[PDB]
Ligand binder design. Sequence first.
Ligand code: HEM
Ligand code: HEM
Ligand code: HEM
Ligand code: HEM
Lengths: 141, 141, 146, 146
Amino acid sequence: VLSPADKTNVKAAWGKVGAHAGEYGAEALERMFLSFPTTKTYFPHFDLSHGSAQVKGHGKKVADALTNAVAHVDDMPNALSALSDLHAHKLRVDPVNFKLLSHCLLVTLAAHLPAEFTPAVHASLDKFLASVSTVLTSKYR
Amino acid sequence: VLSPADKTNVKAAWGKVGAHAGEYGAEALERMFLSFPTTKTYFPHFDLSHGSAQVKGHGKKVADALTNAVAHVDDMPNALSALSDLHAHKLRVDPVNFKLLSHCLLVTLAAHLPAEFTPAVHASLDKFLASVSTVLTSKYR
Amino acid sequence: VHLTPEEKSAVTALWGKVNVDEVGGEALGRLLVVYPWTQRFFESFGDLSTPDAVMGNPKVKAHGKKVLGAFSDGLAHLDNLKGTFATLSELHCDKLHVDPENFRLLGNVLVCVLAHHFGKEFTPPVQAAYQKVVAGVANALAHKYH
Amino acid sequence: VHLTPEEKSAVTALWGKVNVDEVGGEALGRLLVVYPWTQRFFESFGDLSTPDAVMGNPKVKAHGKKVLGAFSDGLAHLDNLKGTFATLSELHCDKLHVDPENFRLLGNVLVCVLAHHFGKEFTPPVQAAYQKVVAGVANALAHKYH
Ligand code: HEM
Ligand code: HEM
Ligand code: HEM
Ligand code: HEM
């Protein structure tokens, strides 16, 4: 459950990300594939080498989705409705993996936002990514 | 999300359990302590030997909580309010342990309900136990 | 995997009563029902849209037999699971692209199935022994992932 | 844990720049803030109800130093983490009653602290090497639980 403080924190952190959101998306993905190789099982059709355009492209889509989630933080389940359908009925990614990507996004943000990544913001961002994950897996069964 | 079919399945299975709720709760705990020994870290004040009075008493309390939850399936956050509060602010059991207990409760039920534990009912109970675990950890942060 | 000799003996004593054909189909079918996302690997099997379709699907039954036959062979080498499942680990990673989390899910569904099948004989200590086995098999199957 | 030679070099090189005292207090503090249920082991430390309280607590700082100092010692014995941490595993299980999931959580928080501190130097390959190390230490600390 996000508190107003959490929403405030996420909107400030995501705002500083700004136009680099897509870049960070791609880096989080690269960090995930290297740190947790079992996640590559969902991308057999991708070139996963460093600097891959598919990774850069997919990173952009993930980032744009998160930006939309932040804009619609008070009604995420409707805002992400299409994505939750796609993940539940088509992609069918095991829920454990969402934690892995979330961790890698936090690591990425920490590496890019020294001043803004305080313990309070870290906590709000972790809750936020967990809520997004929960929404993306809410229609699995 | 629990569908009407899920609710019917759970109600039917738990009704078959009836007066044995407490016995099954104790069995589930013993199963958990033996299969997943890290769970014992939360009970250093208990005698955990087979048939211990503390295990028996605790199993009955756990079972009664689940009976209450089944009866209030459409109103679980309110019905389990005291327990959510207790777990979040006093006991503070790491969320991963709820899936270990839920698995051991399913195994216990399987072992006792030959006719009733069909694949559909198995799914509904697993969903029910996940929902209960979610409510109990909902106030953690 | 480190099972005690009394744990090993309990595991083998119970397994001798298991019809791997029946149990295999039931275990794989329940996995597909209880955790629907695992269906992603079996679109080639046909209709899996309802519990009744899954449980009655002949390809699900045949595959269950194969899986649990390989599991059964593994029980003869509890002291060297890594070795026994090495080729299968490579196959599941490089060719089939199966997330190893699925092996853990199947392990727990199998434990439920054994409990359903044997009832009171599936005691807490016997369960504990099978939990070690199923974790060990999942770890072995995940060892060659990269 | 098996690290490739370049991984070993990366781990060692970065760690040579870490101030254990500082990093330790930050990682433990962040654990207590981000996952507040971990506060259950530290009631005697005082009021831990706000982030500022936690981060400025001298007992959190001190314990952070202790924890990370032991961790540091382990980096010199990557080839035998289990033996190195055996006595500490037994202590955490039998005396302190610490659920080993806590070791996994601290590992991930530690990764975030290193990234925060080192920025761009904490590259994807460097993170991967550290993820292997923190998982190995966590498994080592969990090994003697019974
Ligand atoms: C914050 C969590 C995540 C978000 C917001 C997210 C969002 C998205 C978006 C926006 C797409 C593109 C959909 C489209 O093109 O219409 C997508 C596709 C996909 N996602 Fe998720 N995703 C998340 C986590 C994950 C995880 C954890 C995995 C598994 C490791 C995963 C696997 C996939 C795959 C395989 C695709 C299809 C890629 C392709 O073929 O182009 N995603 N996701
Ligand atoms: C199905 C999920 C669970 C439910 C419904 C449940 C319910 C309960 C209930 C009813 C109580 C007694 C409260 C009272 O004193 O009136 C309790 C206490 C307790 N629970 Fe939970 N519990 C669950 C899972 C867990 C988990 C997984 C653990 C950790 C492994 C755990 C650890 C404890 C502990 C340590 C106590 C205090 C026991 C004592 O000192 O007497 N519980 N729980
Ligand atoms: C106890 C764990 C498991 C064992 C021992 C096992 C064993 C096997 C074996 C022996 C084969 C046939 C290999 C060949 O000769 O081609 C196979 C194939 C396969 N397995 Fe696994 N399996 C296990 C779990 C799983 C699970 C959990 C999944 C997915 C949810 C899975 C997915 C597959 C798929 C998709 C195939 C190929 C099916 C086909 O031929 O169309 N396996 N497995
Ligand atoms: C990298 C993982 C960790 C290492 C290497 C580590 C190491 C240590 C060491 C060296 C001590 C002092 C033991 C002694 O007095 O001889 C200690 C104590 C303790 N640790 Fe761990 N620790 C780790 C993680 C954790 C975590 C995650 C928690 C809980 C969140 C925890 C809880 C405690 C507690 C409660 C004590 C006793 C504190 C006291 O008496 O002042 N430890 N640990």
